[PDB]
Design a protein around this nucleic acid. Structure first.
Ligand code: NA
Ligand code: NA
Ligand code: NA
Ligand code: NA
Lengths: 117, 117, 117
RNA sequence: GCCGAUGAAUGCAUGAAGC
RNA sequence: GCCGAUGAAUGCAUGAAGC
RNA sequence: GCCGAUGAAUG
RNA sequence: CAUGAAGC
């Protein structure tokens, strides 16, 4: 689909777990509208995009945009899992990390692992 | 009606305030069904009957039963107010106090005011 | 799956024919709830279990129990056919023969063919 | 939101009707 | 027509939840 | 319970 | 456009 590279589930789980952790020591935007706004304003440190989005055009612009902004993005399998990770009661098509908090190093590890694809 | 005497509203509010006060340090049975059971078993110390109960036949037996069991009963105007007094979320057609808790003396005063009719 | 032996469709049709014929001179329990109670009460002479039960935990306990109660059980293909055989309007997951009626000998032949498996 | 002491869930009995 | 033995109407125990 | 980040209430 | 978890 609108997917520009495959992502290992090891990495996926690493990322989602990091997203939960950032929620308490950092800042996160959740939902495509917020995330697009964040990337546009150049606040996004790592953006998450779910792969099971129907219709696709809802997240279709996000990979293209992140790459023009040279903002790292990473894909995850289910929007349900991303909804759970940002701490909401509904599925979440995309999200983003805006302020890392204390997790300077973990996020460094993860974004570096993402370039490797 | 099934009403055998009018009750000064002073007496009524004293009764209701008493009932909330008992809810937490003593024992109260709520609903016509539980109430009738308490009276039948000789456990009821004071029963409350709402006057606005329709159909009346739902609480009609309670006065007569109390009188053959020598249980003091008192009438109150609204079942809504009685529900609120026993701390349930719906109106309550009748209720009963089974264990006075610490509020022995006030209960004496109230039953005495009831005898006065 | 709860199926503990294969049953020849020859035997299955025999058993269902016997069940239709008894529902008229004997007694039959129909539906898992009733049938289980009948087995637990030690009244069941033969229990029928449909194989196409979804989810299986509805009838899964029945073999173990019949085994504890020394009750013969026999398996059949469809819950619809079992519903039809006990004479009801909906599919039937399990049933039991409680009183053989006139069919002492036939029910004996059938329980015998069942030991052979 | 709705529903519930004018009796919720539940338990036990029942077991083909209900709308 | 829909629904129902994968349990309808129901009786009783019970008493604050259920959706 | 239904609904809601595929965006609630709102401005 | 702004805001972003409630509303019923
Ligand atoms: Na035996
Ligand atoms: Na069929
Ligand atoms: Na029941
Ligand atoms: Na009932």
């Amino acid at each position: 689909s609108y997917v520009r590279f495959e992502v290992p589930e090891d990495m996926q789980n690493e990322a989602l777990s990091l997203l939960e952790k950032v929620r308490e020591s950092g800042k996160v935007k959740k939902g495509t509208n917020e995330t697009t706004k964040a990337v546009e304003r150049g606040l996004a440190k790592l953006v998450y995009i779910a792969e099971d989005v129907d219709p696709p055009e809802i997240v279709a612009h996000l990979p293209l945009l992140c790459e023009e902004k040279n903002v790292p993005y990473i894909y995850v399998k289910s929007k349900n899992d991303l909804g759970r990770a940002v701490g909401i009661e509904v599925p979440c098509a995309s999200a983003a990390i805006i302020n890392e908090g204390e997790l300077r190093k973990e996020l460094g590890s993860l974004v570096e692992k993402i370039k490797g694809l």
